[PDB]
Design a protein around this ligand. Structure first.
Ligand SMILES: Nc1ncnc2c1ncn2[C@@H]1O[C@H](COP(=O)(O)OP(=O)(O)OP(=O)(O)O)[C@@H](O)[C@H]1O
Ligand SMILES: Nc1ncnc2c1ncn2[C@@H]1O[C@H](COP(=O)(O)OP(=O)(O)OP(=O)(O)O)[C@@H](O)[C@H]1O
Ligand SMILES: C/C1=C/C(=O)O[C@@H]2C[C@@H](CC[C@H](C)/C=C\C=C\CC1)O[C@@](O)([C@@H]1CSC(=O)N1)C2
Ligand SMILES: C/C1=C/C(=O)O[C@@H]2C[C@@H](CC[C@H](C)/C=C\C=C\CC1)O[C@@](O)([C@@H]1CSC(=O)N1)C2
Ligand SMILES: [Mg+2]
Ligand SMILES: [Mg+2]
Lengths: 361, 361
């Protein structure tokens, strides 16, 4: 009976059961086939020297499905200890995800895994119920993708979906750079991983850059040392809010401009006025990234700038937003009105891929 | 730039233009040829000799597709004299018609019609819309069939739906029976048509199959004598209501099938006791057969005498409650909002024919 939720994030894969208050398995979204079978997850990584590791998925989109399945499989078997062709199933996707993909995706569940039933939901949209909403503009900033998702009655709006190709890993990478720069090494991939945690444990969203930037060099009372695994420990200036600053500065690492709140306006201002109003006081926002301090109040103002005078702008940062996408699934999967919403072998059996094509979740 | 409305009525077809507060089209959904290329419409009518014309749409469901193909064709052209690949399209589906049938006329349409965009809905709902409601039981007492469709704010209650195969052209093959007793003709379709003409003319579902049926040996006051083509006038007694009434008596044949009102009830009953009141206080007579006057105050009895005392019950039965289906749909087909629903040429050449099973409204 128990269905299964799996947010196949670009770098992370959240997956547990239905209704389950939280995805049980949350491991690395990559695989490694022989250097000269494959392996995946922590294991996959646990074998650097002799493995050719790659993210089966790129920008929250599947590319080498081999590894992909080489995951899926590991995910029930080597992972969830459960029978595929034995449980209702839910998969997440990215906004404006290419038809044949979303279709190919299904091809495999019944085909190879003979999964009984299944469905597909936009990572976004998931996060939206994960908030108790069926309409709003979301901000699922994972490890490597970014979209502004105009939703209504729980049904999205393509033509108005701004994607800001950039995220999670960017900054992490970003950082290292502005550090190897401030006297510090780290150019091996293994070092990058160090930085991230660092990037997470410390980095924050400066309510104000300039006001903050000076202070950095002016005061200090805004930084700390780091238990570098090596043993040696170290601290960082401006950076703490410079890296996460890149978020509003798609001109911090080269890039193309625009940027977040903008691409947001540049997402809302592509949405039939009638909605706009109500699209303004509901900013949800999932994915590792969004997990920042002050990131909150920071945006609010950002927009109010563009945000016309007397308009109430409300950003909602779900304390658990890191999994909302998954958490959403957990729910919808585990629901009633959703029964008929599934896809069936009997159905997939008779039709083909195009069968999947339906309405909002 | 304009869309279309087509009521594929079991044994009839009404059509016109979205908005157009009349459907300009209404005709015989029959196809026929020489006993030994083809003849559709009332053209087929005048051929009882050379033609052995068979009707399509089988109880509301298609059957000789290749055949039905002509029906439609006969439309835009001979009839409306209009263009297909140039107007959006809407089609009434059959209340709980298989998914197989679906993608058929859907692909067929486009494929062998190159249509802009097409959508399809159950007949039973439009009729509902067609009355200012979106909830409450409806009854497509049309020609070939008569269904009981509970509706909930736009959703039908599959599980909770009833389908009775008696209707219009049902009570007819019969009428031609009851009469062979006072001794008369009416055996050939030639003669069979005359029947319905009479039915719809005189026939009525009054009230008592008793105190009413008591007036019989009684006061030979109120009866009549229709002047048939054969010039010769004819007499009729209780048959003026022995035929229609049969709906509250299947045993008139042997249908060990449920009495209408009862099925309706049955339907309402199989519904969520919560919503049951609304769908109870609401009941529509979508169907030509649903015309036998005085049928108004009638049904009330049939049911409240089963409907829990503390209530109230009304059976919305408008005048054009003979096209409500077509009418109601000729609305959906008129609204900027409707686009979000349509299935355009490109919304098919990419998503296979199964992209039509899924709606919002
Ligand atoms: N507390 C945090 N603050 C900021 N960034 C974080 C935090 N925790 C994780 N991240 C970053 O967000 C990225 C992860 O997100 P998520 O779990 O959002 O990715 P996915 O869903 O795996 O990928 P994507 O959403 O890009 O398709 C991580 O790889 C990491 O770089
Ligand atoms: N005034 C009337 N009184 C009685 N019966 C009528 C009247 N007008 C039409 N009918 C009968 O009702 C039948 C028609 O209904 P409708 O137009 O409801 O049929 P469809 O569209 O062919 O079928 P369905 O509605 O069951 O899908 C006719 O074929 C006819 O025999
Ligand atoms: C705590 C953690 C979080 C995470 O989300 O990791 C994902 C997955 C990870 C895979 C590569 C590493 C070596 C192998 C195992 C990692 C396990 C846990 C790492 O590559 C990221 O780190 C990239 C690199 S730099 C960044 O910003 N994203 C995102
Ligand atoms: C006024 C009318 C109404 C109608 O509803 O016709 C429909 C369609 C009709 C098709 C066959 C005939 C020869 C051809 C053209 C008829 C045109 C108009 C007839 O066969 C019915 O008559 C049958 C016969 S007896 C009955 O109960 N249904 C129902
Ligand atoms: Mg994500
Ligand atoms: Mg009809």
């Amino acid at each position: 009976t128990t269905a299964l939720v799996c947010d196949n994030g670009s770098g992370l894969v959240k997956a547990g059961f239905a209704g389950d208050d939280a995805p049980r398995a949350v491991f690395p979204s990559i695989v490694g086939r022989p250097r000269h079978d494959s392996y995946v997850g922590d294991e996959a990584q646990s074998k650097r020297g002799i493995l050719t590791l790659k993210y089966p998925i790129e920008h929250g989109i599947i590319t080498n499905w081999d590894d992909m399945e080489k995951i899926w499989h590991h995910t029930f078997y080597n992972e969830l200890r459960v029978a595929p062709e034995e449980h209702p199933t839910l998969l997440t996707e990215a906004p404006l995800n290419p038809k044949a993909n979303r279709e190919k995706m299904t091809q495999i569940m019944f085909e190879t895994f003979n999964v009984p039933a299944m469905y597909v939901a936009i990572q976004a949209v998931l996060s939206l119920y994960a908030s108790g909403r069926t309409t709003g503009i979301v901000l699922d900033s994972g490890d490597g993708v970014t979209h502004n998702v105009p939703i209504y009655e729980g049904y999205a709006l393509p033509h108005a979906i701004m994607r800001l190709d950039l995220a999670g890993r960017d900054l992490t990478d970003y950082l290292m750079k502005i550090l190897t720069e401030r006297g510090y090494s780290f150019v091996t991939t293994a070092e990058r991983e160090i930085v991230r945690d660092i990037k997470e444990k410390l980095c924050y969203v400066a309510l104000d850059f300039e006001n903050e930037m000076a202070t950095a060099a002016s005061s200090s009372s805004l930084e700390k040392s780091y238990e570098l695994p090596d043993g040696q420990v170290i601290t960082i200036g401006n950076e703490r809010f410079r890296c996460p600053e890149t978020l509003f500065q798609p001109s911090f690492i080269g890039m193309e401009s625009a940027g977040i709140h903008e691409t947001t306006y540049n997402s809302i201002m592509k949405c039939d006025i009638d909605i706009r109003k109500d699209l303004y006081a509901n900013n949800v926002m999932s994915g590792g990234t969004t997990m920042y301090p002050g990131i909150a109040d920071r945006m609010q103002k950002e927009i109010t700038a563009l945000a016309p005078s007397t308009m109430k702008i409300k950003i909602i940062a779900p304390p658990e937003r890191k999994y909302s996408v998954w958490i959403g699934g957990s729910i919808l999967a585990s629901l009633s009105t959703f029964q008929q919403m599934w896809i069936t072998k009997q159905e997939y059996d008779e039709a083909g891929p195009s069968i999947v094509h339906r309405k909002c979740f």
